[PDB]
């Protein structure tokens, strides 16, 4: 029963690392368009 | 239609009767010396100011 609860432990902390990481690259993605279609560019 | 001595212009110059009297502007008298300027004006959108 402790290692299935470890196992568990694990899948817990690999969808809160993945979860963040997809937020990470959606706003990378979306920093990215922002200047794809920015006046910053120019001031 | 002749004028004997020199170049002068052939082309037919559509002229005008005005308070002044003869006027003629012909178009063959354009030139391409134009003073050019580095500022800038203001169309009085923001939006579009800024956009170049």
Not at chain 1, 5 to 18: H, P, R
């Amino acid at each position: 029963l402790e290692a299935e609860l470890q196992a568990e432990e694990i899948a817990l902390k690999a969808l809160v690392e993945s979860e963040s990481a997809h937020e990470r690259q959606r706003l990378a993605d979306a920093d990215t368009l922002a200047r794809s279609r920015g006046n910053e560019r120019f001031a | 239609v002749k004028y004997r001595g020199t170049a002068h212009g052939t082309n037919e110059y559509p002229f005008l009767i005005d308070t002044d009297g003869f006027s003629v502007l012909p178009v063959s008298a354009l030139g391409l010396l134009h003073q050019v300027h580095e500022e800038r004006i203001a169309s009085g959108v923001p939006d579009l100011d800024a956009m170049m």
